[PDB]
UniProtKB/Swiss-Prot annotation, chain A:
Keywords: ATP-binding, Kinase, Nucleotide biosynthesis, Nucleotide-binding, Transferase. This is Thymidylate kinase. Transmembrane segments: none annotated. NCBIfam families: DTMP_kinase. It comes from Thermus thermophilus (strain ATCC 27634 / DSM 579 / HB8). ATP binds at residues 9-16. Belongs to the thymidylate kinase family. GO terms for cellular component: cytosol. One of its GO terms (molecular function) is ATP binding. The keyword Hydrolase does not apply. Disulfide bonds: none annotated.
Amino acid sequence: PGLFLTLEGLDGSGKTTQARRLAAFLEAQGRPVLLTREPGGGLPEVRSLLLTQELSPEAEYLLFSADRAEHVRKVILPGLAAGKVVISLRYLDSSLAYQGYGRGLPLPWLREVAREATRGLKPRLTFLLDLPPEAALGLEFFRRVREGYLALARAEPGRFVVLDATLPEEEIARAIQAHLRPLL
Amino acid sequence: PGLFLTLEGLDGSGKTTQARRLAAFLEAQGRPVLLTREPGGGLPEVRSLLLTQELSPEAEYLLFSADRAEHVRKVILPGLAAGKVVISLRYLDSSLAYQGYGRGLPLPWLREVAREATRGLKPRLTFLLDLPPEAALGLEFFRRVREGYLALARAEPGRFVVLDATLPEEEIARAIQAHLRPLLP
Ligand SMILES: [Mg+2]
Ligand SMILES: [Mg+2]
Ligand SMILES: [Mg+2]
Ligand SMILES: [Mg+2]
């Protein structure tokens, strides 16, 4: 069958913790599951050098997209073909939020590039862990990314589930499980 | 205003040599020049990344593009803005030939990615060194790449100057010189 879920939000919003707990919930139900992340899941070396360099927003986006392209072909699609629940910590929405809304690249173009890079694969549900940057390129930048994420979620209410990331981690996990139950 | 020139073709066709000699010819007659290349002109580290085992053609192109986007913004446009003649050893057409005609990616997608990466910057002339594919991933790959280059040149016959890469390198350089002389009195 196959089921593709993603987690999104600012760095510091409990995405890794919630990915781990979601995988454990599915492991407890006997559902085979795969945990992965971006950047680095396709091309690990892209993660290393985005860490220690600052490029133009266009170059940054295209590197992320190259990693994304290998990630989809070598990790996500094969996992889904085996009937696994693939959970990716960050996917296309991160690039739209950080490089698009944050750094100012045009979103129609961003989505143009992603069409062939993702082979059109999009998640069935995306969990957005929303919070202000204080609760996790300056504060103004992170504010744009956050509002970008909220704007993206307003546009696709059938795909996005927006959770208050400031809540206790146990409540957030149970909320994710509640939203996910109907799809299993 | 500046002048933007490129050299293109299969590896082994003498492109580096011609780019080097072209630079000299211009320097000699007091035209300041910036000599550069892809892959590596924008992001040096991309050259390592491109050699990744079994890299998808999509990801390969996106790596070339990322390098190309940094190359155009940080090196090529600032050089042209300074009135230099910028010569690039490989540019967009390398990707179109190798990743498009060679690896099978759809050209319109490649061009649309490129539009924002290059800010629409095109070379005034591109010197295509046409080399036989056996003298350059088997032969059938390189056969497609060679013919793709020739297809690109047919579609933009004013931009591309197609030259026989098996000629002596002085005769190639002289032919490049003759095409440029109208562009710099
Ligand atoms: Mg992408
Ligand atoms: Mg948010
Ligand atoms: Mg490109
Ligand atoms: Mg060219």
